[PDB]
Amino acid sequence: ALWQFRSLIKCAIPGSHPLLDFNNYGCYCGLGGSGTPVDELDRCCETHDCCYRDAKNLDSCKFLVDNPYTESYSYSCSNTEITCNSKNNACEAFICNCDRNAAICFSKAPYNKEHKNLDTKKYCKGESDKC
Ligand SMILES: [Ca+2]
Ligand SMILES: [Ca+2]
Ligand SMILES: [Cl-]
């Protein structure tokens, strides 16, 4: 679930505010995206979206017609470390892992505040590079 993803971000990056910080950043950090990623953190967000695309192609997820953004899963946070409950079903487990990979990628990527709230219409028009 989207709110859970943001919780994962807070876990890996306690020093941040998932919404104000990682939403409306670059061309892909936020709901969907387009164009060419502006930087490493932006690439993390692009990758994340493609992860959700892959999820929808999983057998289990297909049958569930599950929506990555609203599908809830079980996770726990421990000292900056994220854990996706092994009891989540295969689809839920793939979605949680997508979010987990994203959160970790964010934590490693440098944050460039000038990439915040870019004009998608004058910096992101076009198609994604991958997926
Ligand atoms: Ca996005
Ligand atoms: Ca669920
Ligand atoms: Cl598509």
* 52: Cβ contacts below 8 Å, ≥ 6 apart: 68, 69, 95, 98
For residue 91, the ligand closest to its alpha carbon is 2
**Smallest-distance ligand from the CA of 32:** 1
Cα separation of 23 and 83, whole Å? 23
Which amino acid, one-letter code, is at 13? I
Is 48 one of the annotated active-site residues of the chain?
yes
Domains of the chain: 1-131 (1.20.90.10)
- What CA–CA distance (Å, rounded) separates 83 from 93? 10
The verdict on whether 99 is a catalytic residue reads yes
Torsion (CA) 44, 20, 99, 91 in degrees, nearest 10:
-130
Structure tokens of 49?
């979206």
User: Taking CA 1 as the corner, what is the angle to CA 114 and CA 74, rounded to the nearest 5 degrees?
Assistant: 120
Resolution of this structure in Å: 2.2
What's the CA-to-centroid distance between 126 and ligand 3, angstroms? 13
Give the Cα separation of 109 and 38 in Å (integer).
Answer: 12
Q: How far is the CA of 39 from the centre of ligand 2 (A)?
A: 32
What is the spatial distance between Cα 80 and Cα 47, in angstroms, rounded to a whole number? 21
Which of 21, 66, 99, 115 is the catalytic position? 99
Q: How was this structure determined?
A: X-ray
Binding site, annotated residues for Ca(2+): 28, 30, 32, 49
- Ligand 1 centre to CA of 28 (Å) is 4
Residue 24 to residues 35, 45, 56, 70, 83: CA-CA distances in angstroms? Answer: 14, 11, 24, 19, 26
Distance, CA of 105 to CA of 113 (rounded, Å): 17
Residue 119 Cα to ligand 1 midpoint, Å, equals 14
